[PDB]
Amino acid sequence: KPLVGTGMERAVAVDSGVTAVAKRGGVVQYVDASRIVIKVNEDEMYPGEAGIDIYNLTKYTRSNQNTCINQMPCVSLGEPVERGDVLADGPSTDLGELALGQNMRVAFMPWNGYNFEDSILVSERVVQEDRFTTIHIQELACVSRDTKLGPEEITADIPNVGEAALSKLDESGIVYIGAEVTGGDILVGKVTPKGETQLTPEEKLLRAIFGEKASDVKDSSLRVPNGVSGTVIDVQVFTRDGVEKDKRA
């Protein structure tokens, strides 16, 4: 929360759908990091079927800016809750207030020109407590599409690869959920057909010496962008109508 605000935070944390307000008043029937069942009050319910307010929070969705949006509860089991009270907090929301940044203990003083022009000098304690460790969610998908030499294949049988890489794929060459990877690793093993190569004679001599035949297929292989390393949290598969699904599908 902002240690020094203007009160106008609630006016923006409740307006943005990032929050989750309570419609009907009651007492919390069940809290969880997935759903929140609110037992509506007898004096504040419809005279038929009586319902309840069963809320469903969002969990770790990729924002338009590749950042992370997620809602977390703020009330424990069995607690009185009126209407207009934040049943759960989302990204940059602290119990109803707009949590834009963080509270940093600043001290105006030069320090060996380490700040010289406008540069900022931060303590090691800050980067230790993970108070600025913002989470991001990239969305990189593979597309097996028909080509001039036949349709591509999403098989884990990739040529010119190692056994240490294909160890993080399934029987269909699709990265295991949760398995942490880094840039250069394979997430979707795909190969595109490519015939009529006609290598140079010097290579043909190699193919005759060590008996290393050349595959008629190229490599597609949706691989993690170099520079960023993360964890797989969702894997979706959309197969065209007609074409029978694979195992992972």
Partner: protein, 228 residues
């Protein structure tokens, strides 16, 4: 050429403590207290969590049916779990606890070589009638700050994908300050006494702190020493 020794050792709170040394020459206080507080706030034995695994939790970005806390928020508190191991080096604990009610930090099985310093700490709030968890904490000793981002290079091949890593922080010390005053003594006109007010975490006792600190300090003089 007076040689100081500890005189006052009173630890007011479990974490907050104080120590003191009188026998100092002209302004030797500053020179000692600053160069000592540095070695304290940087290098200290400590122990902390490094490896954590839960029943079917594959990644920190997930939710378990029954826990009102998020897995990320669980490890976020696991970093605040103070412990102390002596005999072994790396120890695998075992935490099993079910039923509604906040999970105390002592809900873990007691091993032969372990001792908690604050079981009142919170790990995760259970809210379901039949919510049960099974985890095995992996605690070990170290020094300084070690984040999990650079931890995965020594390679060790963690085969179970269900193994999650937590940011390590081996830091017995929390905060330290020093002060100097003019205190009369037996055979001297005017000198200075040095008081060191520190903030531990409950893991390391305040004695070994200054002891091993001065030890490591002296070790850096090996460039010009043999045996005094």
């Amino acid at each position: 050429f007076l040689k100081p020794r500890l005189v006052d050792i009173e630890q007011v709170s479990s974490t907050h403590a104080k120590v003191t040394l009188e026998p100092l020459e002209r302004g030797f206080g500053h020179t000692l207290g600053n160069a000592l507080r540095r070695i304290l706030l940087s290098s200290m034995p400590g122990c902390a969590v490094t490896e954590v695994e839960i029943d079917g939790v594959l990644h920190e970005y997930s939710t378990k049916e029954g826990v009102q806390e998020d897995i990320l928020e669980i490890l976020l508190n696991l970093k605040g779990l103070a412990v102390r191991v002596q005999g072994k080096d790396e120890v695998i604990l075992t935490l099993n606890k079910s039923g509604i009610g906040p999970v105390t930090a002592a809900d873990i099985t007691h091993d032969g070589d372990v001792e908690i310093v604050k079981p009142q700490h919170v790990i995760c709030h259970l809210t379901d009638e039949n919510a049960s968890i099974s985890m095995r904490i992996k605690v070990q000793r170290g020094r300084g700050y070690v984040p999990a981002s650079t931890r995965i290079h020594s390679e060790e091949d963690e085969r179970p994908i269900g193994r999650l890593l937590v940011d390590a922080c081996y830091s017995p010390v929390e905060r330290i300050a020093y002060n100097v005053e003019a205190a009369r003594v037996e055979q001297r006109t005017d000198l200075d006494k040095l008081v060191i007010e520190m903030e531990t975490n409950g893991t390391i006792d305040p004695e070994e702190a200054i002891r091993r600190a001065a030890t490591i300090l002296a070790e850096q003089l090996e460039a010009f020493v043999d045996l005094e």
